[PDB]
Amino acid sequence: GYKVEVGKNAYLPCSYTLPTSGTLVPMCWGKGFCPWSQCTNELLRTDERNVTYQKSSRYQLKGDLNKGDVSLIIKNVTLDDHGTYCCRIQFPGLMNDKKLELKLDIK
Numbered sequence: 001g002y003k004v005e006v007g008k009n010a011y012l013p014c015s016y017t018l019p020t021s022g023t024l025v026p027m028c029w030g031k032g033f034c035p036w037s038q039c040t041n042e043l044l045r046t047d048e049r050n051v052t053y054q055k056s057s058r059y060q061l062k063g064d065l066n067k068g069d070v071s072l073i074i075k076n077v078t079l080d081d082h083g084t085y086c087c088r089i090q091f092p093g094l095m096n097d098k099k100l101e102l103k104l105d106i107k
Contacts, residue, residue: 001103004081010074011062012102014087018068024048026090029059029072034086034099046070082106 004010016025027046030039039045045053046065058076063069070089074081082104089098 001105003105003107004077005107006078007076010072010077010081010104012072012074012085012087012104014071014100014102015063016068016070016089016098018066022066024066025092027070028086028088028090029070030086030088031081031083032086033084034088034101039086039088044072077104077106079106 002010002012016027018024024046026048028039028042029044031041031043033040042053043059044056044061045051050065058074060073060075061070062073063071070087072085072087085102085104087100087102091097
Protein backbone atom coordinates (compact mmCIF):
# COMPACT_ATOMS: atom_id res chain seq x y z
CA GLY A 1 0.00 0.00 0.00
CA TYR A 2 1.03 3.59 -0.73
CA LYS A 3 2.08 5.88 2.12
CA VAL A 4 1.10 9.51 1.75
CA GLU A 5 1.51 11.86 4.70
CA VAL A 6 -1.31 14.05 6.05
CA GLY A 7 -1.62 17.26 4.05
CA LYS A 8 0.16 15.78 1.03
CA ASN A 9 -1.23 14.54 -2.29
CA ALA A 10 -2.17 10.90 -2.93
CA TYR A 11 -1.41 9.18 -6.24
CA LEU A 12 -2.98 5.91 -7.38
CA PRO A 13 -1.87 4.55 -10.78
CA CYS A 14 -4.46 3.01 -13.11
CA SER A 15 -4.34 2.69 -16.89
CA TYR A 16 -5.61 0.59 -19.81
CA THR A 17 -4.31 -0.34 -23.26
CA LEU A 18 -5.88 2.10 -25.73
CA PRO A 19 -6.88 0.68 -29.16
CA THR A 20 -5.79 2.26 -32.48
CA SER A 21 -8.55 4.82 -33.00
CA GLY A 22 -8.54 6.14 -29.43
CA THR A 23 -11.76 4.56 -28.17
CA LEU A 24 -12.23 5.48 -24.51
CA VAL A 25 -13.85 2.98 -22.15
CA PRO A 26 -15.94 4.26 -19.22
CA MET A 27 -14.22 3.85 -15.86
CA CYS A 28 -14.91 4.64 -12.21
CA TRP A 29 -12.94 5.59 -9.11
CA GLY A 30 -14.69 4.41 -5.96
CA LYS A 31 -13.41 4.42 -2.40
CA GLY A 32 -13.87 1.03 -0.75
CA PHE A 33 -13.64 -2.55 -2.00
CA CYS A 34 -14.85 -3.18 -5.54
CA PRO A 35 -18.47 -4.57 -5.36
CA TRP A 36 -20.02 -6.46 -8.26
CA SER A 37 -21.38 -3.77 -10.64
CA GLN A 38 -20.43 -0.07 -10.62
CA CYS A 39 -18.31 1.75 -7.99
CA THR A 40 -19.33 1.47 -4.32
CA ASN A 41 -18.38 5.02 -3.30
CA GLU A 42 -17.79 7.15 -6.38
CA LEU A 43 -15.12 9.85 -6.27
CA LEU A 44 -14.78 10.40 -10.02
CA ARG A 45 -16.05 8.71 -13.17
CA THR A 46 -15.71 8.75 -16.95
CA ASP A 47 -18.16 8.57 -19.83
CA GLU A 48 -16.47 8.43 -23.11
CA ARG A 49 -14.56 11.69 -23.26
CA ASN A 50 -14.23 13.12 -19.72
CA VAL A 51 -16.21 12.94 -16.46
CA THR A 52 -19.90 12.32 -15.72
CA TYR A 53 -19.75 12.25 -11.92
CA GLN A 54 -17.28 14.59 -10.37
CA LYS A 55 -17.42 15.94 -6.86
CA SER A 56 -14.02 16.46 -8.46
CA SER A 57 -11.92 19.22 -6.84
CA ARG A 58 -9.46 17.39 -4.63
CA TYR A 59 -9.81 14.35 -6.88
CA GLN A 60 -8.32 14.53 -10.38
CA LEU A 61 -6.90 12.44 -13.20
CA LYS A 62 -3.44 13.99 -13.43
CA GLY A 63 -2.51 11.82 -16.43
CA ASP A 64 -4.07 12.24 -19.88
CA LEU A 65 -7.25 10.17 -20.16
CA ASN A 66 -7.36 9.97 -23.96
CA LYS A 67 -4.38 7.60 -23.91
CA GLY A 68 -5.60 5.19 -21.24
CA ASP A 69 -4.17 7.02 -18.23
CA VAL A 70 -6.92 7.37 -15.66
CA SER A 71 -4.60 7.53 -12.64
CA LEU A 72 -6.27 9.20 -9.65
CA ILE A 73 -4.77 12.04 -7.62
CA ILE A 74 -6.06 13.35 -4.29
CA LYS A 75 -5.09 16.76 -2.93
CA ASN A 76 -4.36 17.36 0.76
CA VAL A 77 -5.00 13.98 2.37
CA THR A 78 -6.34 13.53 5.88
CA LEU A 79 -6.66 10.15 7.60
CA ASP A 80 -10.17 9.91 6.15
CA ASP A 81 -8.74 9.21 2.69
CA HIS A 82 -7.02 6.05 3.90
CA GLY A 83 -8.38 2.64 2.90
CA THR A 84 -9.07 0.63 -0.24
CA TYR A 85 -9.72 2.27 -3.61
CA CYS A 86 -11.01 1.02 -6.96
CA CYS A 87 -10.33 1.95 -10.56
CA ARG A 88 -12.93 0.07 -12.58
CA ILE A 89 -12.50 -0.10 -16.36
CA GLN A 90 -16.00 -0.78 -17.69
CA PHE A 91 -15.66 -2.67 -20.97
CA PRO A 92 -18.71 -2.91 -23.26
CA GLY A 93 -20.54 -5.96 -21.94
CA LEU A 94 -20.85 -7.77 -18.64
CA MET A 95 -18.20 -9.72 -16.74
CA ASN A 96 -15.30 -7.89 -18.38
CA ASP A 97 -14.42 -4.96 -16.14
CA LYS A 98 -10.79 -4.61 -15.15
CA LYS A 99 -11.17 -4.22 -11.39
CA LEU A 100 -8.19 -2.76 -9.52
CA GLU A 101 -8.11 -2.48 -5.74
CA LEU A 102 -5.46 -0.01 -4.62
CA LYS A 103 -4.68 0.44 -0.94
CA LEU A 104 -3.86 3.79 0.66
CA ASP A 105 -2.34 4.27 4.11
CA ILE A 106 -1.99 7.81 5.41
CA LYS A 107 1.03 8.71 7.53
